[PDB]
Write a protein that binds this ligand. Structure first.
Ligand code: HEM
Length: 123
């Protein structure tokens, strides 16, 4: 079974992403990164992306992480502390949802992988 399946499939990822962005938009460390972002589109992209990242689909139909975040890094100071806040807010959300700690560990490994971090941060 994939991580996506184990989490609860579409409805779990849908709820997690909704809740995650509710948390992010109240998080003073990072909320301003989203000030000019269409959140309906963002929510849809993230549901699709995490579905992919959790093994629910073979491909992500949207931008690569590096291009997606380039303008934040170059113009808005996006750094490692912001990255950790995002990972932390994602894990807090799953925890709140009652996700078992072994699956939170699996998500931690995806969100913290260098192939993710280096591209997001354009490092
Ligand atoms: C790392 C945990 C991480 C993931 C995963 C992620 C996902 C993601 C997606 C799927 C998009 C949309 C891509 C598309 O257009 O197809 C996207 C875009 C934005 N992100 Fe992100 N993102 C991750 C990391 C971070 C971090 C650390 C921040 C800032 C605190 C951040 C923020 C944003 C913003 C803002 C956008 C929209 C950019 C824009 O078009 O204005 N992400 N992210």
């Amino acid at each position: 079974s994939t991580l996506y399946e184990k989490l609860g499939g579409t409805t779990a990822v849908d709820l997690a992403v909704d809740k995650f962005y509710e948390r992010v938009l109240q998080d003073d460390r990072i909320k301003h990164f989203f000030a000019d972002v269409d959140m309906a589109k963002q929510r849809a992209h993230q549901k699709a992306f995490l579905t992919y990242a959790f093994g629910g689909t073979d491909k992500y139909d949207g931008r690569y992480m590096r291009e997606a975040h380039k303008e934040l890094v170059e113009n808005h100071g996006l750094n490692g502390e912001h990255f950790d806040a995002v990972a932390e807010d994602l894990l807090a959300t799953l925890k709140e949802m009652g996700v078992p700690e072994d699956l939170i560990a699996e998500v931690a490994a995806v969100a913290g992988a260098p192939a993710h971090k280096r591209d997001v941060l354009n490092q």
